[PDB]
């Protein structure tokens, strides 16, 4: 099937705090595999999956040193943004970045990603063409023009098509499953409530329906054990239980599960 790599990076300023806290987290197929936190005693990228311990000391030295470079980057950019938005000293501020690559099942590059947010809101993103930028805000135009004049896009493109694809290939060999949902319905004395539960599944993505014709739900939640939970409920007249069926749709299923109150 398809594959992906992402790095999610955060820098956070607070009022007194001399310097900002920088965190970088790396994901391969949405599972965390490396992490760097400048708050740590010895700040460095650590393996986050046993299959990463196999990387030599060159890996950890080069990656750790890159992260220190990012910390500074985020530090300087955090200063610039303050000025761009005519913000003053005394506030808390956040700068975020997502970057990485999507591969198809053939392992070819489907899509590069490079996006940034300031105060949790879209700031500037590299378009899918990997050549042009989108930047909504007026303040963002100082950066867009700066980055057009500097040819940054070409350099982000080179990383996205080269190094990102290349090391994901490597990681995927070193890292060598969907857990299906077990479903069941519960009964609660609302006129009664039918609650279709879904449990033990991975990945989180899932749909639950209630029926004949096409309801309360909860957001998908982690069990804490790597797997996910969800439920969905409807209010139903008494005795009229069997007239209602729940369908669960998940990628790990051979076909959608069908259930009723039993």
């Amino acid at each position: 099937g398809p594959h992906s790599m992402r790095y999610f990076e955060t820098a956070v300023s607070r009022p007194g705090l001399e310097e900002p806290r920088y965190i970088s987290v790396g994901y391969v197929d949405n599972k965390e595999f490396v992490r760097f936190d400048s708050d740590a005693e010895n700040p460095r990228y650590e393996p986050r999956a046993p299959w990463m311990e196999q990387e030599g000391p060159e890996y950890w030295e080069r990656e750790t040193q890159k992260a220190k470079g990012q910390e500074q980057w985020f530090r300087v950019s955090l200063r610039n943004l303050l000025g761009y938005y005519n913000q003053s000293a005394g506030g808390s501020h956040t700068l975020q970045q997502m970057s990485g690559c999507d591969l198809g099942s053939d392992w070819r590059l489907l899509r590069g990603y490079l996006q940034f947010a300031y105060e949790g809101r879209d700031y500037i993103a590299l378009n899918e063409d990997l050549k042009t930028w989108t930047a909504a805000d007026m303040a963002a135009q100082i950066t867009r023009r700066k980055w057009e004049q500097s040819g940054a896009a070409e350099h982000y493109k080179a990383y996205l098509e080269g190094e990102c694809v290349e090391w994901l290939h490597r990681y995927l060999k070193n890292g060598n499953r969907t857990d299906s949902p077990k479903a069941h319905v519960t009964h609660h004395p609302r006129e009664v409530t039918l609650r279709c539960w879904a449990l033990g599944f991975y990945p989180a993505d899932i749909t639950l329906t209630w029926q004949g014709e096409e309801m309360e739900l909860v957001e998908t939640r982690p069990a804490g054990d790597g797997t996910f939970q969800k439920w969905a409920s409807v209010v139903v007249p008494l005795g009229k239980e069997q007239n209602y069926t729940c369908r669960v749709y998940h990628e790990g299923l051979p076909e959608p599960l069908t259930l009723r109150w039993e």
């Binding site: 790095y7 970088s24 790396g26 990656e63 890159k66 992260a67 470079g69 990012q70 980057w73 300087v76 950019s77 610039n80 943004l81 761009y84 700068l95 970045q97 970057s99 490079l114 940034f116 700031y123 500037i124 950066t143 700066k146 980055w147 500097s150 940054a152 350099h155 982000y156 990383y159 996205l160 190094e163 990102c164 090391w167």
Partner: peptide, 9 residues
Amino acid sequence: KAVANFATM
């Protein structure tokens, strides 16, 4: 491997 950004904002 992580990207190392280019020009600052």
